[PDB]
Amino acid sequence: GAMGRSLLQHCKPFRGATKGCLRALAMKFKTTHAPPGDTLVHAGDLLTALYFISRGSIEILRGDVVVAILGKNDIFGEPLNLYARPGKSNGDVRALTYCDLHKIHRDDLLEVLDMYPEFSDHFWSSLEITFNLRD
């Protein structure tokens, strides 16, 4: 489907997902369309979603200082497989330009990966989170 094809643009983490696995992931991902200036994550928020940027630019702030710019195929959040509870964000995440993001909630991603344990190992090993927001 269209979402599955969109997710494949994030090459390495989705490499090797079978049709059933990619379909199950795609059903839980949503496309977020953020206009300039919209804040996607506030400092201190629980890190309950993983974000893949499809296009557009994102500002990461620590305090009110811009500390990173993320763009196409960059990823932000925290690895979801390391703790039973979500961490809190060390920074604000805001759109610089119009942005299209693929967003999956933590609970939904972990539930899908329950059904695909070998893919889950590949996913967390090959995920290279561009900006780890864990405080």
Side-chain angles (χ1 to χ4, degrees), residues 101-120:
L101 303 101
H102 296 130
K103 181 187 181 180
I104 187 164
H105 297 304
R106 172 179 164 102
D107 290 332
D108 294 335
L109 179 55
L110 290 174
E111 170 183 45
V112 172
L113 293 182
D114 285 340
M115 282 279 338
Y116 300 98
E118 277 155 314
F119 177 75
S120 176

Side-chain angles (χ1 to χ4, degrees), residues 51-68:
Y51 300 77
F52 300 71
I53 300 166
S54 180
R55 70 193 48 84
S57 288
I58 287 276
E59 285 169 327
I60 314 286
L61 298 99
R62 185 157 190 121
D64 290 321
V65 179
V66 175
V67 297

Side-chain angles (χ1 to χ4, degrees), residues 17-29:
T18 62
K19 181 62 185 185
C21 175
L22 182 66
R23 171 180 289 128
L25 292 163
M27 290 296 286
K28 299 295 179 182
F29 269 95

Side-chain angles (χ1 to χ4, degrees), residues 3 29 31-35 38-41 49-56 58 76 95 97-105:
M3 177 63 79
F29 269 95
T31 297
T32 290
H33 295 290
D38 259 28
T39 297
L40 294 99
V41 181
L50 187 60
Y51 300 77
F52 300 71
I53 300 166
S54 180
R55 70 193 48 84
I58 287 276
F76 58 90
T97 66
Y98 286 91
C99 288
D100 304 318
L101 303 101
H102 296 130
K103 181 187 181 180
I104 187 164
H105 297 304

